[PDB]
Amino acid sequence: SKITFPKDFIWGSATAAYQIEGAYNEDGKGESIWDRFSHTPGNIADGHTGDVACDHYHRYEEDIKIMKEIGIKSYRFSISWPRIFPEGTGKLNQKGLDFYKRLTNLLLENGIMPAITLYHWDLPQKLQDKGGWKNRDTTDYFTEYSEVIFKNLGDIVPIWFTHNEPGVVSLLGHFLGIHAPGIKDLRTSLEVSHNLLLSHGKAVKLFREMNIDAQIGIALNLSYHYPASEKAEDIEAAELSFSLAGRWYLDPVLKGRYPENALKLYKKKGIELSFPEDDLKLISQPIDFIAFNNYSSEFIKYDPSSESGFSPANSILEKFEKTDMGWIIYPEGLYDLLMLLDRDYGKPNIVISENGAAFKDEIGSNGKIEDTKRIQYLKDYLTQAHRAIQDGVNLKAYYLWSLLDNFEWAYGYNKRFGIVHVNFDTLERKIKDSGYWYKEVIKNNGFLE
Amino acid sequence: SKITFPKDFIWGSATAAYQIEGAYNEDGKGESIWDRFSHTPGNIADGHTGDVACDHYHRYEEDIKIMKEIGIKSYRFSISWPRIFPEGTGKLNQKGLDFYKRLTNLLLENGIMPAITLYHWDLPQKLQDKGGWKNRDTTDYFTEYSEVIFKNLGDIVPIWFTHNEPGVVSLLGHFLGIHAPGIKDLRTSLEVSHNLLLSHGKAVKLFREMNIDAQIGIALNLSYHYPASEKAEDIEAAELSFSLAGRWYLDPVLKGRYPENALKLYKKKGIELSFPEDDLKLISQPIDFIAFNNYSSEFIKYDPSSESGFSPANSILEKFEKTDMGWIIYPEGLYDLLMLLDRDYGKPNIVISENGAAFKDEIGSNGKIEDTKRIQYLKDYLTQAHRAIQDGVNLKAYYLWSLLDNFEWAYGYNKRFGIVHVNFDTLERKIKDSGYWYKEVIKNNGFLE
């Protein structure tokens, strides 16, 4: 029927600093927890690292020329804290500022709109030696680094994101220890989650003290959690999952409270931590939008066997086509989530910081990546993005993960979310057909479903 | 019978940069191969690191005050290449220069004589990413860093050392892989040995050209290798040891050649390497003294089972008292060595860069270390040091390993060579009776054995 998005609708594409930049020990960059986690056997697939990656630190001219060829209206990227403070606090590395100052000024001049994320998982490894995000002092040092970025880049950068997916940091990084910094303790994982949100609060508070003419938010990891069957135990098992997962960070930020059903689950395993009541008021600090990262959806069943009181319903999930990551494809799962954010947090302004997919790419005998599946995935999800805007959602932006094939954390370079293929041996970019598609979607401001 | 050393004789004590300094990521210091090797499980005992160590970087005032309170006339220490050049070459780091500038000036102003080692194993990790010592271009970068140190600290600082124990670096670090950078390939272990020596040559050749009013040398790991029995297979086995071990580095430096018997061992397992045979004239470059590091002596027997063609004669070695390291005590094994270097290399000027011993220390109820064994060890070895000077040897200096308790590489902090006890929780120095002994031994010159 032709879908057309709002005229003012910002199209964009996203990347992260460690994932693409490289140059892990150049121009006075301090070590990050990821440099350190990446160097140790057993952590990354095939013993990959982010030492070189896409080498975006040197080749950012070539990238921007590509970005403009496709003609994205907004490039979402991450600032490396260790390039701005190698020691987390103290001596400013002016080289690392200049790089991001330059990059932003090349974006503005090429008519592309900058969208900065202030913490995309790096954490200087020096703050990790004094406890990292467990040491509350880190939340102040985050604010110092936030301050210096705002002074320099404040006004000229419209869209800000304090943190990317604090959910995965605390869960994978501090409880399961298959992300950096590789810690494995439940109590610590909950102390960090708080200390992260607090750090978001302190940045917003400072962002209002300075009065930067720009919009700030927080990028959360969010999926819809559907019950396995419309039965009291399974509906409740799902509501507890979403609470432990995405509502644990949504409710403190937007409702100035932690979800009760989750908190009860923690104390039933003999764990309470007395969050000071003032900290939640500081976390709840009003924000100009909520941003989130979606890819799939979860199907939870009741399970006394898991100490959680629930588990995935693998019976149901083995009915969907799966991405290369093993994650189900379910486009409507996006719509229902948008509607959940609309009908639980007061019709806020919504941004999509990340949405995309990972399929096995090849360069064919024609020297081209014909990733019809990625394209299929994309347009399916974007039809449900549109559907939600039609039914009254305030979705202001869509950022495609990712612009470039990059370092996918504990999977290494074995998974490609890029719309621009990157050969990690030659560092040659080949714009995918999902790149050329996206270009036309931005131009036409839609596609004929 | 009282022994008295020459009146000019320089008494000293020795430490290394990574073993005491700490501040492993402060004031722009680049990562080293040791920082990297320490941070990986299964390398260092009890997962110990040199991240903090004795924290000499911040507490050097205190450590000089002690150095002056005890006699010592010269302090031998190591400069961290990564503090000078974080990337091994290119951008300076003036904060790293100023630290070692300031340190040396406090030594000259407290009437103590500086003795600098230029490479004590902390190769910048960036150069290890481009092949490290196996990439010949590291032997040029070594010279660049040497240049900058000579410009600033050349004429002041009388004693220099190009390398520390390049025998261990190549054997442990690049064949056995139990030292940094952890590599396990024989071929690569000999290519590095050559590249290290070559790097020594280039530094001495650059020294002079600049015309620095001071003496340069090289600190080599050196024992004596006694045959198990006075038999043709055992005498020869012992000669082939030594040749692999210490002579491999002695002969190239002082004779301009590699030991034949050894080279013949390496071609018998199908391994040659084309020495450009003019590098060897650059390595052989005359040098003002030869320095070495002795602790024990080896007793080799013939062994067709060991693909070496020899092994330790455990039958004999189990008749000596043993240090905490498991190394035999044999004082006369110093003398015979001091006669072997005196005979076979043209009565050179000799320095002892290191001697000392590791015994289990306790703080008694009197809050004092009564390390009678360390004192016993010391005086036993020094008596044979004297004996060699009486029988003609040109031994100009003795440096006690070590001033402080430190990071003993793969053994962690489990081993104490120090004459100054260091508590690696509090960082409190308690001078170790062996310390107080050594103060009197410097003041009255020798001692009554």
From Swiss-Prot, chains A, B:
Pfam families: Glyco_hydro_1. It catalyses: Hydrolysis of terminal, non-reducing beta-D-glucosyl residues with release of beta-D-glucose. The lineage of its organism: Bacteria, Bacillati, Bacillota, Clostridia, Eubacteriales. GO terms for molecular function: beta-glucosidase activity. The active site is at residues 165, 354. It is an enzyme of class 3 (hydrolase). This is Beta-glucosidase A. One of its GO terms (biological process) is cellulose catabolic process. Its EC number is 3.2.1.21. GO terms for cellular component: cytosol. PROSITE patterns: GLYCOSYL_HYDROL_F1_1, GLYCOSYL_HYDROL_F1_2. Transmembrane segments: none annotated. It comes from Acetivibrio thermocellus (strain ATCC 27405 / DSM 1237 / JCM 9322 / NBRC 103400 / NCIMB 10682 / NRRL B-4536 / VPI 7372). Pathway: Glycan metabolism; cellulose degradation. Keywords: Carbohydrate metabolism, Cellulose degradation, Glycosidase, Hydrolase, Polysaccharide degradation. NCBIfam families: BGL. The gene is bglA. Belongs to the glycosyl hydrolase 1 family.
